[PDB]
Design a protein around this ligand. Structure first.
Ligand code: NAG
Ligand code: NA
Lengths: 102, 77
């Protein structure tokens, strides 16, 4: 079993400023749950999201690592990647784009 | 054509690996790239290879030390 992040290339979401939002990193893992982190692209550099509220929602055959927007603000517009650390391995998701309206 | 934040792996546009890592598994349209840590004393050579860091001999000085991305640089004294 390989650890996999199921975010589709060119994935996008349209969301309303002032409404709460849940951005999901769908994780396939078989044994020990990896350490996953969100980051936001500026050009070709993924700034880790350190001060941000995150949670897990576990399902039978996949698990969701959620980045919470409480609430979404206009500055949350942009591209987000999710990353998983298992031992010496680093699994890197496709970026998903948020479009905010206000 | 791939976006500048991506890297061509096959005929597929994929997320890159972080500096000290080589590609251990190619991404698909729906799945992640898998990266593995190049061990100490090696540098990421291509997308996929860790190459052993060359040693500047006694008849040479180290101009730049071996990083996780680039080999040692040697010159004559
Ligand atoms: C390389 O590192 C060694 C210590 O391991 C040090 O003695 C040497 O001066 C360094 N050279 C450069 C150019 O940084
Ligand atoms: Na992915």
């Amino acid at each position: 079993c390989d650890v996999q992040l199921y975010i589709k290339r060119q994935s996008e979401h349209s969301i309303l400023a002032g409404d709460p939002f849940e951005l999901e990193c769908p994780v396939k893992y078989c044994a020990n749950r990896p350490h996953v982190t969100w980051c936001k692209l500026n050009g070709t550099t993924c700034v880790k999201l350190e001060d941000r509220q995150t949670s897990w929602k576990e399902e039978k055959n996949i698990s969701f690592f959620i980045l919470h927007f409480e609430p979404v603000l206009p500055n949350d517009n942009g591209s987000y990647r999710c990353s998983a650390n298992f031992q010496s391995n680093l699994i890197e998701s496709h970026s998903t784009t948020l479009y905010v309206t206000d | 054509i791939c976006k500048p934040e991506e890297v061509q792996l096959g005929d597929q546009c994929c997320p890159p690996c972080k500096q000290g890592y080589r590609v251990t598994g190619q991404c698909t349209q729906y799945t992640s790239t898998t990266c593995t840590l190049c061990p100490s004393g090696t540098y990421v050579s291509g997308l996929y290879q860790c190459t052993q860091c060359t040693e500047c001999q006694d008849t040479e000085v180290t101009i730049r030390n071996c990083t996780s991305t680039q080999n040692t640089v040697c010159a004559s004294k």
